[PDB]
A paper describes a structure:
TD1 and EcR2a are both soluble proteins with crystals grown using vapor diffusion, rhodopsin–miniGo is a membrane protein with crystals grown in vapor-diffusion plates and PepTst is a membrane protein where crystals are obtained using LCP methods. The deposition method was carefully studied using a variety of cases, including the lipid sponge phase, which is notoriously difficult to extract crystals from. However, successful blotting of sponge phase was demonstrated, offering new possibilities for handling and background reduction for sponge-phase samples. Blotting of the sponge phase was successful on the silanized chips; as shown by investigation of the background signal. This allowed a membrane-protein data set to be collected from the visible crystals. However, the procedure for sponge-phase blotting still requires substantial improvements and is not yet suitable for crystals that exist in both the cubic and sponge phase, which is a common occurrence in LCP crystallization trials. When a surfactant is present, i.e. for lipid- or detergent-containing crystallization buffers, the wetting on the polymer film is usually sufficient. In this respect, the chips presented here represent an attractive alternative delivery method for sponge-phase-grown crystals.
Residue numbers in the entry: 5 to 270, 275 to 405, 423 to 478
The structure:
């Protein structure tokens, strides 16, 4: 019967809903760093380029950290379907803010809107995907992979369309197209959802019991009061610069897993098996750090060290989702072909880290051989994104912990990307790439012990 690639027809609605949100997100991130460079060059934004690179990282870290709670707010308060809609509305307004004839004053407002909007929409669209499949249904893994292709499809075409629009009609026009991209998703999601989506998800599936509202309000109130108390203390002692606030969000993002892990210990049944997660989680952190630097460090390398005089330099951001779109058909073949091998999930996380380390190690070669004073070939970045996406495919298959590793890895980037420049290029690439490889080699021994557990 009628399907969307063998799947329920509701997938096409959610497939396009997320493609257009990812089009709006990754089209914005493809030019946002260059937009901050431009505001710096005109004197409107009084920060260094190292700070702007750190802003891009802590931006992504907060976006994925905000996704760790959107599932809770939907499942318990507002509902999954209203969360996606109003989440996209906030995402749309965030891109409209950057389209207004403002400058650096509109950066923080746009960032807050997209952080909150993505937190509402991003996890709940995937939740609504699994609601098309009953728990017995076996097309789940096939349906989510189709869903991933739509994530990367919009992520691939966004820098091409938005980047070219920036170099032709300017930034404000380019950011408006990102808002239009989200608006297109809202139209298809609203009217398309009303036809094929279960109305049971217009409301929370686990609404708060009467006795649960007060302790939750206390819990939220104490967290906001403490976070505000820290900001007050910082301004009293003089720690009030923008890098100081970035350091605060970095500590907060990293303190969440280490506190959620330190007291997860207290039952020897899985007391050691809880520990087995740690090497897999920390490996996921360092990989997402390497992977998310493509929009920061590799975006900086493309703009300064590559002869890209015949196309917009923001198009290099399409290499990350392009290789995924190419690897997916091969990788679908691979996992069902080598059924007898069955690579253990721990072992995969090193190969993903080794590949990520290889991608940076490769990028240390052009500067060591030709120097950093000139321009190199664009195929260095093509070969670099070819290796890191290779590792992403291996690590590709609660999502909040998944959101958390990306947030911690991106929070780690908020500190490291400030070390990158033309004079530190070779050492930065070589040492962070070498250290990531040797930390993939230590996994072999640690995987064996996790295999035993
Ligand atoms: C999506 C971005 C990927 C771009 C990959 C480009 C692969 C290019 C390979 C050849 C090296 C650059 C050649 C420069 C070039 O031919 O310029 C033409 C001439 O006008 C001199 O600038
Ligand atoms: C005006 C600025 C507001 C910006 C809002 C950004 C809020 C981002 C994150 C808040 C939620 C942090 C709590 C995350 C958490 O503990 O969940 C992790 C847990 O689910 C692991 O599975
Ligand atoms: C209008 C205010 C901004 C939009 C409201 C949503 C702000 C995000 C979070 C508010 C706190 C909700 C509680 C989150 C929470 O308890 O997460 C628990 C965690 O275990 C999730 O699994
Ligand atoms: C700047 C935009 C302001 C908001 C304009 C749109 C508000 C107009 C009507 C409210 C529609 C709320 C729909 C919420 C919802 O859950 O939609 C889910 C979708 O699947 C349709 O059921
Ligand atoms: C419980 C709260 C968890 C912490 C979440 C707070 C995250 C809020 C905002 C993060 C925005 C990152 C910094 C944005 C920024 O620096 O841009 C403004 C700057 O351009 C103005 O000069
Ligand atoms: C459909 C509702 C949400 C979609 C966004 C709607 C608004 C999008 C575009 C309207 C025009 C954008 C403004 C373009 C602009 O002002 O920049 C050009 C000019 O300022 C620089 O020379
Ligand atoms: C300055 C540019 C305009 C700024 C405001 C743009 C807001 C325009 C339209 C609101 C979009 C609402 C979401 C789109 C949608 O599908 O809504 C359908 C629903 O509201 C119909 O009941
Ligand atoms: C940072 C500002 C956040 C503003 C919104 C955060 C709200 C967080 C916790 C309070 C949630 C109370 C919702 C009560 C509710 O809707 O359920 C009531 C009913 O189901 C109980 O019988
Ligand atoms: C629940 C216990 C609360 C005790 C305080 C918790 C937070 C402790 C320190 C937060 C420091 C914020 C980031 C450090 C900082 O501001 O560095 C400033 C430096 O970069 C120059 O301004
Ligand atoms: C008893 C709890 C376990 C033991 C405490 C573990 C430490 C807990 C939180 C610290 C978070 C890591 C520090 C954040 C970080 O590495 O960046 C520091 C930097 O941003 C300051 O400028
Ligand atoms: C198969 C893809 C992986 C290829 C990467 C393997 C190459 C490993 C390391 C190459 C970087 C060497 C760094 C050379 C170096 O730093 O020398 C110092 C001086 O020459 C440059 O400042
Ligand atoms: C899983 C498959 C991985 C296969 C990767 C094989 C790549 C082997 C070597 C690549 C090292 C980088 C190439 C260095 C190089 O050719 O520099 C010279 C270049 O300028 C030629 O003009
Ligand atoms: C199988 C992968 C191909 C081989 C990868 C190993 C490449 C190792 C180093 C990168 C090329 C070395 C660049 C020359 C160099 O670093 O020395 C320069 C320095 O001596 C000048 O003072
Ligand atoms: C699985 C893929 C592994 C990637 C293998 C590593 C290859 C990476 C870069 C090769 C650099 C070749 C650059 C030489 C070239 O063709 O362009 C010449 C240059 O002078 C034009 O600008
Ligand atoms: C069947 C899949 C095998 C893929 C693994 C091989 C990786 C793909 C390309 C590696 C290219 C090696 C670098 C080529 C090179 O050294 O530059 C050649 C250049 O000097 C010719 O002008
Ligand atoms: C199990 C949780 C995993 C935690 C992974 C994060 C590792 C903990 C702390 C990393 C701190 C990185 C500090 C970077 C640094 O100090 O150098 C950069 C600095 O100069 C920026 O101004
Ligand atoms: C020699 C250390 C054990 C080798 C383990 C295998 C690691 C994978 C590839 C070798 C990477 C060599 C990196 C060379 C390097 O880091 O040079 C640093 C350079 O800045 C100082 O000249
Ligand atoms: C075990 C968890 C590891 C997670 C954190 C790994 C990195 C931690 C700290 C790195 C900051 C120290 C910077 C060392 C350094 O000199 O690198 C900069 C150099 O490459 C350019 O000058
Ligand atoms: C400068 C030398 C560069 C090349 C060295 C890289 C390869 C050398 C050693 C890698 C494997 C070390 C032994 C790992 C091992 O088999 O331990 C047992 C482990 O498999 C148990 O799970």
């Amino acid at each position: 019967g009628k399907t969307f690639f063998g799947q329920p027809l509701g997938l096409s609605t959610l497939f396009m809903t997320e493609m257009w949100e990812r089009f709006s997100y990754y089209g914005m991130r493809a030019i946002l760093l260059y937009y901050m460079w431009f505001l710096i060059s005109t004197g409107d934004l009084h920060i260094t380029r190292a700070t702007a690179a750190s802003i891009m990282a802590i931006y992504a870290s907060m976006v994925y950290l905000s996704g760790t709670i959107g599932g809770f707010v939907a499942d318990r308060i507002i509902g999954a379907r209203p969360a996606v809609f109003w989440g996209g509305v906030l995402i749309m307004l965030g891109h409209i803010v950057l389209a207004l004839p403002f400058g650096a004053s509109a950066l923080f407002g746009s960032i807050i809107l997209i952080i909150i909007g993505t937190g509402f929409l991003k996890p709940n669209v995937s939740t609504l995907v699994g609601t098309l499949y009953d728990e017995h249904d076996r097309r789940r893994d096939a349906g989510f992979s189709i869903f991933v292709f739509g994530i990367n499809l919009g992520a691939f075409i966004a820098p091409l369309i938005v980047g070219a629009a920036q170099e032709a009609a300017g930034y404000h026009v380019a950011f408006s197209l990102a808002a239009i991209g989200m608006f297109i998703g809202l139209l298809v999601y609203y009217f398309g959802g009303k036809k094929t989506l279960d109305p049971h998800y217009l409301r929370p599936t686990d609404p708060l019991a009467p006795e649960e509202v007060k302790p939750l309000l206390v819990k939220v109130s104490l967290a906001v009061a403490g976070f505000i108390a820290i900001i007050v203390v910082m301004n009293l002692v003089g720690w009030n610069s923008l890098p100081a606030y970035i350091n605060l969000l970095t500590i907060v993002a990293i303190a969440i897993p280490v506190f959620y892990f330190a007291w997860m210990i207290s039952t020897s049944t899985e007391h050691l098996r809880v520990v087995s997660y740690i090497p897999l989680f920390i490996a996921a952190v360092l990989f997402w750090a390497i992977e998310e630097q493509g929009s920061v460090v590799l975006a900086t390398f493309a703009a300064e060290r590559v002869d890209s005089s015949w196309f917009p330099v923001s198009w290099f951001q399409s290499l990350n989702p392009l290789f995924i779109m190419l690897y997916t058909p091969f990788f679908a073949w691979l996992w069902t072909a080598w059924k007898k091998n069955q690579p253990s999930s721990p072992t995969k996380f090193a190969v993903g880290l080794m590949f990520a380390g290889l991608s940076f190690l490769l990028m240390a070669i052009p500067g060591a051989l030709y120097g950093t004073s000139g321009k190199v070939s664009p195929l260095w970045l093509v070969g670099s994104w070819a290796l890191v996406i290779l590792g992403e495919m291996l690590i590709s298959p609660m999502m909040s912990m998944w959101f958390l590793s990306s947030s911690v890895g991106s929070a780690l980037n908020a500190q490291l990307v400030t070390l990158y420049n033309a004079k530190s290029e070779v050492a930065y690439f070589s040492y962070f790439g070498l250290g990531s490889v040797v930390l993939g080699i230590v996994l072999v021994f640690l995987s064996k012990r996790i295999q035993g557990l």
